[PDB]
């Protein structure tokens, strides 16, 4: 079994610059369980990242949430970078605030 | 209150 | 409504890097409330929801002792399975277990279950009768025969029908302000251009609890379930959930499509347009 992760990046609230919020990186539907997940602000690792909500689905694939409190600004960009055996390269998923 | 015994396979 | 107490267990070998990674994660309904992680600096069972502060130090000590015992049993299991499947000591392998019980709004047992997997595939599972096991291959049949002669099902049944139910009731009482609340979804629709005179309409539902929700797109009273893209309902980092559902529609005809949101916090379903 090898299942590539789906990586979903999203805020708790619709983003308003200057207002506190939460950024989420939900990494789902993957196997084997070994994985590296890093939240990045302007290309730099965010230090205070909480890992939570680890579970598996009925087909046994893994689910896990990375999240952090943040205040969006006009200029700051955010991404989630994931390394997993299923992928040839690390995958960097950018937060799309207009999605 | 978690299961406290998982029998060996 | 109904409620569940669930424990997700995972053990992962890592040859050449020392002992397996061992984790337990407990959920009441869709909310994480306890966890154990062997990679922590001082591995202990720890609370993950605020209301678990109402348990005394004896609770955490006992859960921690169970976890360390369980950890050792899965280390042995990982070794045993190399024999069962004739696998080398060089590869990483994964055991997963889901155990739990569910009760109605009146606190009475609805069902209990335990299911195991090896390397992401069914290994063995307790049948719904809570008396017999079902095994997925020859390796699991050995395990089944062991557990039958030891009477393991009877011990497990007593936990699922008694201990599991009784503690779930206690957590629902202690965590009432969190677990029995309803947070209403807030919904909006976004719009994105595509090539070929078509448009993506995406309906968002934000800030809701509990996790169960239904999002549908409609055109003239018929649901477009087959033509929808969806994400699985997902945690938003603060104990609430979010979801989205999209449809591709002809440019200029956006006004005819409506998104419908159904949730226990919505006395009447929401209906949205672009």
Which positions in chain C have a beta carbon within 8 angstroms of at least one beta carbon in chain A?
A: 8, 10, 12, 14, 23, 25, 27, 32, 35, 48, 92, 94, 96, 98, 117, 119-122, 188, 190, 202, 206-207, 231-232, 234-238, 240, 242
Q: Is A86 on the interface with C (CB under 8 A)?
A: no
Backbone angles phi, psi at C29, to 5 degrees: 50, -125
Pairwise CB contact (< 8 Å): C80 & B1: no
CA distance to C245, C247, C249, C258, per residue, from C227 (Å): 10, 6, 10, 14
CA distance C23 to A3: 21
CATH number at residue A88: 2.60.40.10
| Residue finishing a domain among C158, C181, C204 | C181
SS (H, E, C) chain C: CCEEEEEEEEEECCCCCCCCEEEEEEEECCEEEEEEECCCCCCCCEECCHHHHHCCHHHHHHHHHHHHHHHHHHHHHHHHHHHHCCCCCCCCCEEEEEEEEEECCCCCEEEEEEEEEECCEEEEEECCCCCCEEECCHHHHHHHHHHHHHCHHHHHHHHHHHHHHHHHHHHHHHCHHHHCCCECCEEEEEEEECCCCEEEEEEEEEEEECCCCEEEEEECCEECHHHCEECCCEECCCCCEEEEEEEEEECCCHHHEEEEEECCCCCCCEEECC
Distance of CA C171 to the CA centre of its chain: 17
Burial of C57 (0-12, 13-18, 19+ CB in 10 A): exposed
Structure tokens at C155: 């011990």
Q: Do C166 and C33 belong together in one domain?
A: yes
Nearest CA among A4, A10, A27, A2 for reference residue A98: A10
- The answer to whether C27 touches C6, Cβ cutoff 8 Å, is yes
- The answer to whether C53 touches C36, Cβ cutoff 8 Å, is no
Query: What is the torsional sign of CA C63, C65, C69, C74?
Result: positive
* The Cα angle at residue C42 between residues C41 and C45, in degrees rounded to 5: 120
Q: Do C99 and C146 belong together in one domain?
A: yes
CA distance C88 to C238: 43
Domain encompassing residue A59:
1-99
CA distance C189 to C259: 8
Q: Do C20 and C152 belong together in one domain?
A: yes
Nearest CA among C49, C40, C260, C86 for reference residue C175: C49
Structure tokens at A25: 């990186």
Structure tokens at A48: 């205070």
- The answer to whether B2 touches C63, Cβ cutoff 8 Å, is yes
Pairwise CB contact (< 8 Å): C206 & A50: no
At B1, is the secondary structure helix, strand, or coil?
coil
CA distance C53 to chain B (A): 14
Q: Do C199 and C127 belong together in one domain?
A: no
Q: State the number of CA atoms in the 13 A half-sphere of A27 facing the CB.
A: 30
CA dihedral of C134, C139, C145, C148, whole degrees rounded to 10: -50
Bond from prior residue into A32 cis (ω within 30 degrees of 0): yes
Pairwise CB contact (< 8 Å): A3 & C235: no
- Cβ-based neighbour number of residue C71 at 10 Å: 21
CB contact set of C253 (below 8 Å; sequence gap of 6+): none
- The answer to whether C181 touches C266, Cβ cutoff 8 Å, is no
- The answer to whether A66 touches A58, Cβ cutoff 8 Å, is no
Domain encompassing residue C108:
1-181
Nearest CA among C220, C199, C214 for reference residue C260: C214
Q: What is the DSSP annotation of chain A? A: --BPPEEEEEESS---TTS-EEEEEEEEEEBSS--EEEEEETTEE-S--EEEEEEE-TT--EEEEEEEEE---SS--EEEEEE-TT-SS-EEEE--TT-
Burial of C34 (0-12, 13-18, 19+ CB in 10 A): buried
- The answer to whether C45 touches C52, Cβ cutoff 8 Å, is no
CA distance C274 to C269: 17
CB contact set of C149 (below 8 Å; sequence gap of 6+): none
C3-27 burial: b if 16+ Cβ within 10 Å, else e: bbbbbbbbbbbeeeeeebbbbbbbb
CATH number at residue C196: 2.60.40.10
Structure tokens at C169: 């009731």
Query: What is the torsional sign of CA C45, C51, C57, C59?
Result: negative
Method: X-ray
Distance of CA C188 to the CA centre of its chain: 27
Bond from prior residue into A65 cis (ω within 30 degrees of 0): no
Structure tokens at A80: 């989630």
Q: Do C175 and C273 belong together in one domain?
A: no
| Residue finishing a domain among C132, C156, C181 | C181
Structure tokens at A11: 């805020």
What resolution in angstroms, rounded to 1 decimal? 2.0
CATH number at residue C147: 3.30.500.10
Q: Number of folded domains in chain A?
A: 1
Q: Do C143 and C211 belong together in one domain?
A: no
Q: State the number of CA atoms in the 13 A half-sphere of A90 facing the CB.
A: 11
Own/partner pairs, C154-160, CB within 8 angstroms, 24+ separation: C155/B5, C156/B3, C156/C114, C156/C126, C156/C130, C157/C112, C157/C130, C157/C131, C159/B3, C160/C99, C160/C100, C160/C101, C160/C109, C160/C112, C160/C113, C160/C114, C160/C130
Which chains have at least 3 CB atom pairs separated by less than 8 Å from chain B? C
| Residue finishing a domain among C154, C181, C208 | C181
CB contact set of C155 (below 8 Å; sequence gap of 6+): B5
Q: Number of folded domains in chain C?
A: 2
Q: Do chains A and B touch (3 or more CB pairs under 8 A)?
A: no
CA distance C237 to C243: 13
CB pairs under 8 A between B and C: 51
Q: State the number of CA atoms in the 13 A half-sphere of A74 facing the CB.
A: 0
């Amino acid at each position: 079994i090898q299942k590539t992760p789906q990586i979903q990046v999203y805020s708790r609230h619709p983003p308003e610059n200057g207002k506190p919020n939460i950024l989420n990186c939900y990494v789902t539907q993957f196997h084997p369980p070994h994985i590296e997940i890093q939240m990045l602000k302007n290309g730099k690792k965010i230090p205070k990242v909480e890992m939570s909500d680890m579970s598996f689905s009925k087909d046994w694939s893994f689910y896990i949430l990375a999240h952090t409190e943040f205040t969006p600004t006009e200029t700051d960009t955010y991404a989630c970078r994931v390394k997993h055996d299923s992928m040839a390269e690390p995958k960097t998923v950018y937060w799309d605030r207009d999605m | 209150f978690a299961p406290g015994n998982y029998p060996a396979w | 409504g109904p409620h569940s107490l669930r424990y997700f267990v995972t053990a992962v070998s890592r040859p050449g890097l020392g002992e397996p990674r061992y984790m337990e994660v407990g959920y009441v309904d869709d909310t994480e409330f306890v966890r154990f992680d062997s990679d922590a600096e001082n591995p202990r069972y720890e609370p993950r929801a605020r209301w678990m502060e109402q348990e005394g130090p004896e609770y955490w000590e006992r859960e921690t002792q169970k976890a360390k015992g369980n950890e050792q049993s899965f280390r042995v299991d990982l070794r045993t399975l190399l024999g069962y499947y004739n696998q080398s000591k060089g590869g990483s392998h994964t055991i997963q277990v889901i155990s739990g019980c569910e009760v109605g709004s009146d606190g009475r047992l609805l069902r209990g279950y335990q299911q195991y997997a090896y390397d992401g595939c069914d290994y063995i599972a307790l049948n719904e009768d809570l008396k017999t096991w079902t095994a997925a291959d020859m390796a699991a049949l050995i395990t089944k025969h062991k557990w039958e002669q030891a009477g393991e099902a009877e011990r497990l049944r007593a936990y699922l029908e008694g201990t599991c139910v009784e503690w779930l009731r206690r957590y629902l009482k202690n965590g009432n302000a969190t677990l029995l609340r309803t947070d209403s979804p807030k919904a909006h629709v976004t719009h994105h251009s595509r090539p070929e005179d078509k448009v993506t309409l995406r309906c968002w539902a934000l800030g809701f609890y509990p996790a169960d929700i239904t999002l549908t797109w409609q055109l003239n009273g018929e649901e477009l379930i087959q033509d929808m893209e969806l994400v699985e309902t997902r945690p938003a980092g603060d104990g609430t959930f979010q979801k989205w559902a999209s449809v591709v529609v002809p440019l200029g005809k956006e006004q005819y499509y409506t998104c419908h949101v159904y949730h226990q916090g919505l006395p009447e379903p929401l209906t949205l347009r672009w």
